[PDB]
UniProtKB/Swiss-Prot annotation:
Domain Galectin: 7-138
Upper classification of the organism: Eukaryota, Metazoa, Chordata, Craniata, Vertebrata
Top-rank taxon, per record: Eukaryota
Subunit structure: Monomer.
Section covered of the full-length record: 13 to 159 of 326
Biological source species: Mus musculus (Mouse)
Function: Galectin that binds lactose and a related range of sugars.
Name the record gives this protein: Galectin-4
Chain's gene name: Lgals4
Tissue expression: Epithelial cells of the embryonic and adult gastrointestinal tract. Expressed at about equal levels in colon and small intestine but much less in stomach.
Domain remark in the UniProt entry: Contains two homologous but distinct carbohydrate-binding domains.
Amino acid sequence: YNPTLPYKRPIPGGLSVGMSVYIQGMAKENMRRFHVNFAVGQDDGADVAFHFNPRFDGWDKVVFNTMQSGQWGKEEKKKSMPFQKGKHFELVFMVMPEHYKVVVNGNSFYEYGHRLPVQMVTHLQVDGDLELQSINFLGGQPAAAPY
């Protein structure tokens, strides 16, 4: 709840199709980039099923990729920037059978097809030029997380 950075949060009960990740934060006034990782492990070198990476340099854009066995795969990207320097934003990831759907501030933004099984994701990692306000989960079985 208004954590530091980097922020690593275990997903109570694991990640499953149907769930949603709700991120509230603020892009820094001097932001260059930041990322959200759907990681498969606690450690920093853990593989990443879905890497969401907004980049503010040259062509303002967002990069999407997967890291398996320490190797980044084919990079995907949308040459559009839904975030604004110094502005509060609402990032929502919905897990569907075929892909993660990204919605920024209510605006549908992208659909990243699954490369790594959704269920291998155990942690949500956030870091970069932003202020993190909160990370919330919706749907699925909460296991030990109270609500």
